[PDB]
Design a protein around this ligand. Structure first.
Ligand SMILES: C=C(C)[C@]12C[C@@H](C)[C@@]34O[C@](Cc5ccccc5)(O[C@@H]1[C@@H]3C=C(COC(=O)Cc1ccc(O)c(OC)c1)C[C@]1(O)C(=O)C(C)=C[C@@H]41)O2
Ligand SMILES: [Ca+2]
Ligand SMILES: [Ca+2]
Lengths: 95, 556, 79, 129
């Protein structure tokens, strides 16, 4: 169990922090674009990015087409980052 | 036995145009001569005889067979000397250089403006046997050239493409000789030919000097500029890490950290203004003039970015055309600038479609911010893998996945529910299930639906494992050094563009090397060179012999 | 597993396809044509000339100089 | 094992050219109607199958070779490969045998060999439409 805790620390720091940086930029940029589209009682970029995060977790006429297309690209990119992060772990362990 | 009589007959027959120099005529074999044949057949005695009977030692075999771009064709330069050299016949090479009647010239060049050095760069490939040959011949001719024509610097002769043998090796991705030339030392008298020197040496420590002539960015069409943009080889990144260049490029970067951070702040700001502008959009309905102020800046910056990217593609990209793989990062900036400007036109022309284009440019602009991650190593490699995974790997998985998704989507909706199917709503509802977003809704043959669903979940899992296995297999097979080089080349791109300058030009930045008098005894005045000094530490030096140095001590 | 295998297994999949395409679906007798070019490789042990249907493959070998030269059909590069 | 097989096999072909010229030993089929090459294909004997297809012999008894060199200039050259038992045109071809008849795990290894791989690439290019 003790070595297991050692690897957690390593994974959190070197790999997850880097994912988080890229993921937050993606989250912010896409959230604002979705808010600018909504437009009135305005949900805060924070409140929005929150709404988009809970969306990913699954909890839950220029407006309709762009809103959906932008979201589809979002889900893919977030998964790409996870797959990249997984690949980064494998390459690190061998070395 | 018939050649000597045969030629005498020809001369005694009064032929004005001698037979020995007769050359072939068809577009395929144009220019070939009997001397070419004697050399290819590796018979010096025949070579001597043909030359002794007036064989033109500078006849060029220029036909299609002797051209560089054709398949199943041999390009060796067009001249006999290049042939002999390119087929590793020193006995022939020496006679062509040393015969009294008609010495061959090391300065001679073919229809492409290529000398024997140019050709040797062309014939070389990364195989070991070939590479060892090329360096041995290449060097052996430089020594000969120092003897036969001292005043001429053979590596200074350019071709019609204006490329010296080193630049040629760079453009054509010839690592083994390119590496050899840069790290070249001569121990014989012609010390000047070497590009590597040792300034001084103290115990284990020592400083080595690397000639930067064709390399440094100061000159036009430098090796660095060539590799970054002109070279089109897959292993160009491998060249950047070679001993002198990697240290040199790191130096140029360290001096350029400010400009990088500055430009990052500028772009960041521009995005903040772009961010505010899109958030405050109200669709149908000092402060309102300030909102126009934002739009102006966006239009102004979008064209500047569009102009900048155009300049990058305008400067060198005209013969490249589709360079998507080579410069993935550069494309997105152009699209963002292009999309941003187009969005502003529509905004001005009250077009209801601009909003998607405006937000699309906003989201893309923020994502493009990953560009500047190349400043740090860890983030730079992560951004490189993103580019790699998204680019080559995602297309194939997605293409296969849609076939499964589409085929399963039609069958399950058609099976569940006059009944109105939406291909979108169907594929969407099924995609969100895998994505974890939503859940499947019962119509209220349920049994068949369940079996079909089992096939989908597992088969979808199989595709994931293949993607992981195929993605994973690339990492193990790939050399650990390889992935890192692609990043160092990205940095090399940045430094070179910074040296270019913005629109308010900041050109003629200070040189990166220091100039020293490397050679004491050239044929004439002392030879000065711009060298890059690289410190070395070797703990096994005691057994080996000490190198000849310029200075006597670390001082001076 | 050998890394090369997956690529070869695919080349065999293509090999299966190509051969069945030559057979044909219902119009079977159309794709019956010899490949390669027929040349006179040499003389046989039986006096008649040794003719064969050959396939051309271009090669480039940089270490051949030391070894002896092979007997060739033509005197110079043709085609 | 393979080094013996190729060495012995070749030495017997040369002897056969001297002892029985009119006889083509590689033409004799067995009760299953397989020549030595087709047998090697069906039984997945890669090393000798490879050797047979690309065989070179010098000076006397030059004929019993499946690889020839049309011409040679410096490093470049054009090599000719006998396609007798190979071409798909012929019945019970080596390709047909490997593709369908052979039951060795390593059939795929056999397809990627100098004469066959190039040939299959050619036929594929012709069949893209
Ligand atoms: C035409 C291309 C090359 C491209 C344009 C769009 C659709 C893109 O998705 C891709 C692929 C894609 C499309 C749709 C869904 C998922 C993925 O990749 C980029 C393109 C890829 C992204 C992801 O971020 C990156 O590209 C990383 C990156 C940015 C800038 C760089 O200088 C860089 O170099 C290291 C890397 C941003 C998007 O443009 C974006 O913000 C939107 C809304 C979609 C992303 O299409
Ligand atoms: Ca899940
Ligand atoms: Ca998983």
């Amino acid at each position: 169990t003790g070595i297991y805790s050692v690897m957690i620390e390593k994974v959190i720091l070197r790999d997850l922090l880097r994912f988080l940086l890229v993921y937050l930029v993606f989250l912010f940029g896409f959230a604002v674009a979705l808010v600018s589209l909504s437009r009135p009682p305005y949900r805060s970029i924070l409140d929005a990015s929150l709404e988009l995060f809970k969306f990913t977790i699954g909890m839950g006429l220029r407006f309709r087409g762009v809103v959906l297309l932008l979201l589809l690209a979002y889900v893919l990119l977030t998964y790409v980052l996870l797959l990249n992060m997984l690949i980064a772990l494998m390459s690190e362990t061998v070395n | 036995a018939c050649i000597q009589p045969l030629l005498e007959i020809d001369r005694d027959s009064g032929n004005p145009q001698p037979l020995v120099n007769a050359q072939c005529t068809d577009e395929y074999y144009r220019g070939h001569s009997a001397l070419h044949i004697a050399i290819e057949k590796r018979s010096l005695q025949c070579v001597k005889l043909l030359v002794e009977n007036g064989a033109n030692v500078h006849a060029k075999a220029c036909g299609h067979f002797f051209q560089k771009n054709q398949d199943t064709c041999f390009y060796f330069g067009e001249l006999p000397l290049s042939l002999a050299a390119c087929t590793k016949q020193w006995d022939v090479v020496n006679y062509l250089l040393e015969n009294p009647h008609q010495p061959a010239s090391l300065q001679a060049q073919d229809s492409l403006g290529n000398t024997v050095l140019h050709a040797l760069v062309m014939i070389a490939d990364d195989s070991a046997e070939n590479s060892a040959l090329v360096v041995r011949m290449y060097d052996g001719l430089l020594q000969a050239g120092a003897r036969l024509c001292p005043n001429v610097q053979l590596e200074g002769i350019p071709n019609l493409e204006g490329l010296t043998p080193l630049k040629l090796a760079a453009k054509e991705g010839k690592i083994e000789i390119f590496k050899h030339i840069l790290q070249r030392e001569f121990s014989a008298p012609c010390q000047s030919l070497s590009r590597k020197f040792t300034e001084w040496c103290y115990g284990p420590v020592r400083v080595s000097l690397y000639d930067l002539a064709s390399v440094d960015s100061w000159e036009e069409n430098s090796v660095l500029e060539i590799i970054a943009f002109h070279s089109r080889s897959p292993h160009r990144h491998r060249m950047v890490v070679l001993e002198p260049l990697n240290k040199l490029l790191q130096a140029k970067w360290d001096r350029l950290i400010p400009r990088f951070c500055f430009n990052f702040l500028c772009y960041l700001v521009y995005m903040l203004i772009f961010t505010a502008v899109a958030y405050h959009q109200p669709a149908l309905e000092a402060g309102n003039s300030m909102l126009l102020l934002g739009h102006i800046l966006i239009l102004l910056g979008g064209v500047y970015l569009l102009l900048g990217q155009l300049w990058y593609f305008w400067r060198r990209r005209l013969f490249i055309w589709i360079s998507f793989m080579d410069s993935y990062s550069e494309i997105l900036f152009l699209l963002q600038a292009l999309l941003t400007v187009l969005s502003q036109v529509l905004c001005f022309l009250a077009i209801e479609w601009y909003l998607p284009l405006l937000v699309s440019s906003l989201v893309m602009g923020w994502t493009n911010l990953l560009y500047y991650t190349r400043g740090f190593q860890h983030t730079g490699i992560y951004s490189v893998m993103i580019e790699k995974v998204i680019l080559r790997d995602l297309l194939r998985f997605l293409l296969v996945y849609l076939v499964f998704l589409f085929g399963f989507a039609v069958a399950l909706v058609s099976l569940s529910r006059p009944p109105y199917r939406s291909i979108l709503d169907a594929s969407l509802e099924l995609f969100k299930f895998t994505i974890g977003m939503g859940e499947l809704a019962f119509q209220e043959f349920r049994g068949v639906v369940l079996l079909l669903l089992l096939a989908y979940v597992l088969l979808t899992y199989v595709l994931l494992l293949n993607m992981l296995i195929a993605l994973m297999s690339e990492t193990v097979n790939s050399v650990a050094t390889d992935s890192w080089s692609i990043w160092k080349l990205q940095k090399a791109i940045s430094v070179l563009e910074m040296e270019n300058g913005y629109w308010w030009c900041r050109r003629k930045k200070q040189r990166a090397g220091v100039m020293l008098t490397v050679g004491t005894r050239p044929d004439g005045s002392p030879d000065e060179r711009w060298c890059f000094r690289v410190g070395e530490m070797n703990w096994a030096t005691w057994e080996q012999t000490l190198p000849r140095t310029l200075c006597e001590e670390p001082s001076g």
